Amino acid sequence: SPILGYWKIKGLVQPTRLLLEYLEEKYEEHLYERDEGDKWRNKKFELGLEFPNLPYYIDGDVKLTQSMAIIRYIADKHNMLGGCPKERAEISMLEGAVLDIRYGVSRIAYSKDFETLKVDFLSKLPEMLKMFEDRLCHKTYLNGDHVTHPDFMLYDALDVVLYMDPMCLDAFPKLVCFKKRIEAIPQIDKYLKSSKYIAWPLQGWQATFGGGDHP
Amino acid sequence: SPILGYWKIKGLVQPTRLLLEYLEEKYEEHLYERDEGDKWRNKKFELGLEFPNLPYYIDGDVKLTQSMAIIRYIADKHNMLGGCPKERAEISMLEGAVLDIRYGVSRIAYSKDFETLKVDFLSKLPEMLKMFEDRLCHKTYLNGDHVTHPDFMLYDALDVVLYMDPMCLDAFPKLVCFKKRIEAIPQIDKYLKSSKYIAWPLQGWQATFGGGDHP
Numbered sequence A, B: 001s002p003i004l005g006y007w008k009i010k011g012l013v014q015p016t017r018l019l020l021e022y023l024e025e026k027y028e029e030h031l032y033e034r035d036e037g038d039k040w041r042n043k044k045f046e047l048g049l050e051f052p053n054l055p056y057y058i059d060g061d062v063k064l065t066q067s068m069a070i071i072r073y074i075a076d077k078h079n080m081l082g083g084c085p086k087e088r089a090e091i092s093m094l095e096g097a098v099l100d101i102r103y104g105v106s107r108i109a110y111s112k113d114f115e116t117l118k119v120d121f122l123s124k125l126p127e128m129l130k131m132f133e134d135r136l137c138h139k140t141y142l143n144g145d146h147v148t149h150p151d152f153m154l155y156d157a158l159d160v161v162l163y164m165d166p167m168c169l170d171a172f173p174k175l176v177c178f179k180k181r182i183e184a185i186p187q188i189d190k191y192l193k194s195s196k197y198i199a200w201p202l203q204g205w206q207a208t209f210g211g212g213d214h215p
């Protein structure tokens, strides 16, 4: 049974959790609490990891880091990355465009100047969301009729960005509607209501935005 | 004949250029000069691009953005991404670990506080480089005997990081040796000596680090 190691936060790994749950995949978690950085520094080089980091995925022999390699791998095992170069690259484009939002948040969230940097990010964010709103015009999910992993990436980014600004989706009905549709997927619905859902923090606990024990 | 659009800078796209040259691939470039931001704002939505950005790749019907989707696509056309989920994920791990360095630089390079932020990045950088030095112990390239696209990604990151600190490879002989080996690849050697090589800037021209018309 594979292992997903990460902090007990949403952060980089939350979209991978959602995808594991959507595929009804078994996995145990190594969850590093806020006060358990020492427990991590003590396992870091003892896991057989060639690029030691968090998150890590361990599928006995397959010993993986980098959250994007991990999410893509799980999708790969279920044959969900694309059937030719073209489709594979559209998925990788969806992927990276979502990351522009999610990393956009992460890159300012630990800054002393978070509050002012917030203004410049929320100015840009409508252009970014519009690309996704247009893609979902006549298209149920990001890649058509079936879920792919960038759907869960997008879901995660909308969730996070709605804490930063509760009104940032009011111009984007198809995006509001996408977020609900992911929530209605029976597997996802059971997970978000379960003991395993980590509601908070969005970021590391020490962050100006999305940190702390509670919202 | 496909088109690679980008600023006339190294930036996000330089590793893709290197890979196109290694594969002896034909491509014309759209190169946005420093003073040509208006020329770009005027083509941005007229290219058939669903997530308009720079870089973009256009392979007639295939209309792509996001530099990581683009680099991976070109490699895909040459069957270089991996033959099973396992190998595909190792490549994606190599990829992302290199990006930790390259984005690590980009994320501070435009900051007012660049010079102090530089200190904290160069403190971390030896741990990051050590993972690559260890991987290249008994292994010619990052993935064994053959070049894969993360090799050119690593090359780009070493080049950039050596401007930040000319001595940052003095503890890492196998990495110094990797950088030279890429330079000795006949295709790469011809490109770096050619009119097409864009030596500078490393970043956008407005950057504190790696900017300006000249080094």
Ligand SMILES: N[C@@H](CCC(=O)N[C@@H](CS)C(=O)NCC(=O)O)C(=O)O
Binding pocket: A011, A012, A044, A052, A053, A054, A055, A065, A066, A067, A068, B096, B100
């Ligand atoms: N690009 C990497 C980023 C790795 C990273 O910045 N990891 C953070 C977690 S948010 C960490 O605290 N890692 C522990 C460590 O560096 O030892 C990824 O996608 O996994």
Ligand SMILES: N[C@@H](CCC(=O)N[C@@H](CS)C(=O)NCC(=O)O)C(=O)O
Binding pocket: A096, A100, B011, B012, B044, B052, B053, B054, B055, B065, B066, B067, B068
């Ligand atoms: N994650 C994206 C980043 C896109 C990006 O930040 N592009 C910069 C170039 S360094 C830009 O000036 N794009 C022009 C625009 O946003 O209209 C990628 O890898 O292509």
